[PDB]
């Protein structure tokens, strides 16, 4: 190892001294602009680590070829190209595609090093193999197909150019235990890339952490307490994972998010910088230096230009390389979801010729919806490939047991899923009509000679209550069924009468659709008194979900919330009962409430929540529950894993809050899980249409008909689609709607 | 034809109407040819099937009647309502025998074993109570459920009773050991209807897979049968389109009878793991049904205040 | 005026030559109110009409203190136990009122606690002929003749 290190050093010596190549490349990369501010030491340390991994690669090749070791000529040809590759991925890894292309063409212009001959293929699209030649990544990525069982599973990762390049980068970083940051927009694929890289290393265990705005180092201390232990050594106190021989990697998803103090500092970031540079942290229990044996880090963050994020300190960025993952774009997303649609459209063999136009329509609609609803208009108007993954998963779940479906039905389920993913979060009627019209015109453009009236209609509702299959339903029969179910429901849980209308039908269908899937958390935005809690309670009762209310009152400290969470998690994981954790914004008092909600909604487990004899009680209860279920568990790690999996499988959290022009932004800053792991349903205030139907239904059982009624010539109308000529009851319910509107005015 | 192969065919032989509230349970008298139904209008209605005519009015309850049960002779009738009362009726007198109290909530179910020495009932007060026929006293109360018990049904000899709750679990009990034999936590929703296999069905179930054999029907649109000896799901039957509220075994032991919330009644072949005939029962939802051991007649309660009498062939 | 203009525009005739105090309150009940320390103003009489014909339990923003005395004088035959939200002996008085079916008046609603949300929302369970409501950790039967009034002495208070 020392000999091959010396040979590599002697062959890369002419490229380092004075100007050479690295100095000019660095001074050009400084002129280039990046996502994060580029300190020279960060990229230099990144380049040094990648060259060390090159030496390790040569050593492993020598081990794999014991008869013929590494020849000096092939070694020099390999190093002379790995140096260019590493310089490119070090000085351009945190920038955009066009800027890394500019750095590549500048390097090609300036260097006297052999390079592949390509009129337009960038040097960044190449790999220096161990044989010493340039192997393109396009030959490395295959045109694979996935089975119908895993169509949109969280673990399936179809490979692309950017995917395999970031795979190689993350393997190179994690092979020598160096912290790294996966910066990029939400939904870009950073945690998917990290998990797919970690599953190629069987010697590492991943820990998921989600930072909030009110993040303190006590969260990392609790994680270290839960997943590691303190061991006394003659050289000091050493913190090591309990899993012997396994390297623990901590995944922090919101590095940029913790609030910067008034003096420009972040306590968690300074803590991480201290334990990265010095290799340890001070324990406040007895003021003793605690050293880390096998603890590495990986970070994820949105770009600092995002409204809720803060730039990182250069002293922390010095040790930590950052790579910028961008959105896949149209030309890659087309095959990324083309393989998924060709895999899923095998259950119905008569639709296999429509997978390519289906993918084209989905990509076109997603791109043309991305451009309009920017984050400037609303804080939750973020669109990501996570929405397309949920789209194909929903179409697969609707097409799974159906076994027979025409093209009109396929485009109609496409339109319904598009509505559910691109209308629930929307606010205004104008933009809702925009989405509806654009869905219609996209279907018209990409699906010619089809039955438009049969494919597209007004209600487009789908229930699984009238039938086991996920069939479309009609509004009148659905309303009759909901009437009968409410008549049954009044005598069991809540004896409060309700009036039903189309908005209520849509809301209960959406809430049932989100309750049916695992790990389904709601976020209902609307004015108080709109019936969100009652509708959620009715749907949870009809789906067989227990409803939990924390019953907040005076002097509600954090301990009461913690014991409520302990009871909810215990009954949801050990007793194995479906529970609908419904709680309003008024139930939130302190920042610890929202921190625990962030952790539970993100990972499904709260580290440090069960400490002391309650942890032993939880372990005994989980062992008893595993015995009752019929699968044996020993130790404590797999018991905790099974309990966590049960919590994801069972627990559903419903969050209700009033809309606000600053409260929503503050909530998004202080809890990203509410806007990431929860679907945002914007109930809003009751529309004039809803008020009109409520008034017309409620004022129907009393005598209000005058046969001699004169139609006014001016006819002041505030509810659109009013029948002409209106009757007396029509006029008075329109007057009631006008009265409500003038109170608003 | 032979009693083994009595199957219902459309349409219905009789169309009865006149109730002012949805029908809960319609069951067969064991001796004489008189129909009787229980509804939620605080009364019990009496009809006929060989002529399809009104017979007599029984008005003793004050709140919504939930369940009714018969003895072996048919001379005793036990009914339960929402007034936390238990009322007894007779066939030889057609009057009120006794009025009992002690339940803390609505009494969901009552059951009379063929011995007839005492009447067991299940209520919504998280308890199961059995009361004697000579004194009307709750000598022993079965407890151990956490939600309201929906239906209770013992076996043919009364040596082992079973009950269903909302804990996705059916519990079997013994009138001597006073403790649960086995807990059966396999369903995913509320269990509503429980049936017991006759003596003729034991060999059929054994050759399809001793006894006794237990079948449980739940709201999860699935029907499964269970065995006391092994405590394991024998086979899973899937295909009921909506919520299942009533199940019953065939007297021949080869088929089953069940009703669903989709306004249909279906007959299933557990040998072929598939149904063989589906009929549109009523214009609205249905609740329960029953089958006669000898007479070729089958009825089905409903919600639209209509009871339809079907002749098997 | 806006509602009357709209109803005139929509050709729905309404009695213009009437007072909203006189059409809603009878002479005998007006005399009873004036005997029970109510001010003779038409605004105060309209407030009394609202306090009589309420459906949701009302909140009284009365800095002068006369409306509290008017409430205690109007509901004088029925016992009223005056208490405050911040008082430690408030929940016990609430359960006593819920059990015994007598009107209750609570002041200082700026210190509002969400324990009264099931009561204000009428989240009630029907046990046949028995009416049941559950708040906190105890189950209490609800009498039909129970009314609760919230009082305030600060006008410039912001309510969620
Ligand atoms: N190349 C790809 N192949 C398959 N799925 C992809 C690809 N790129 C993105 N995805 C989808 O995007 C999602 C990744 O988003 P995620 O990494 O969770 O973003 P963030 O970590 O910023 O929240 C995954 O659910 C995945 O299905
Ligand atoms: N569609 C409706 N018909 C009748 N009453 C309704 C309807 N929607 C809401 N309500 C009334 O409004 C109240 C809303 O209560 P809740 O849902 O707890 O508050 P929020 O609407 O803020 O979630 C209910 O008590 C109910 O009586």
Numbering used by the authors:
A (entry chain A): 2412 to 3156
B (entry chain C): 89 to 297, 307 to 410
C (entry chain A): 3530 to 3689
The paper states:
Cytoplasmic dynein-1 is a conserved, minus-end-directed microtubule motor critical for cell division and long-range intracellular transport in eukaryotic cells. Dynein, a member of the AAA + (ATPase associated with various cellular activities) family, forms a 1.4 MDa dimer composed of two copies each of heavy (HC), intermediate (IC), light intermediate (LIC), and three (TCTEX, LC8, and ROBL) light chains (LC), with the IC, LIC, and LC known as accessory chains. Cellular and structural studies have shown that dynein primarily exists in a pseudo-twofold symmetric, autoinhibited Phi state incompatible with movement along microtubules. LIS1 plays essential roles in the activation of dynein, including relieving autoinhibition and helping assemble the fully active DDA transport complexes.
To visualize the conformational landscape of dynein activation by LIS1, we incubated full-length human dynein with ATP and LIS1 at room temperature for 5 minutes. We identified three major species: individual dynein motors (Open), Phi, and a third state similar to Phi but with two LIS1 β-propellers bound to dynein, which we termed Pre-Chi. To fully understand dynein’s activation pathway, we began by analyzing particles corresponding to Open. We observed significant conformational and compositional heterogeneity in the Open species and used several approaches to sort out the coexisting subclasses. We obtained six different Open subclasses, which we categorized based on the linker conformation (bent, intermediate, or straight) and the presence or absence of LIS1. In monomeric dynein, LIS1 has been observed bound to both sitering and sitestalk, and to sitering in the absence of binding to sitestalk, but not to sitestalk only.
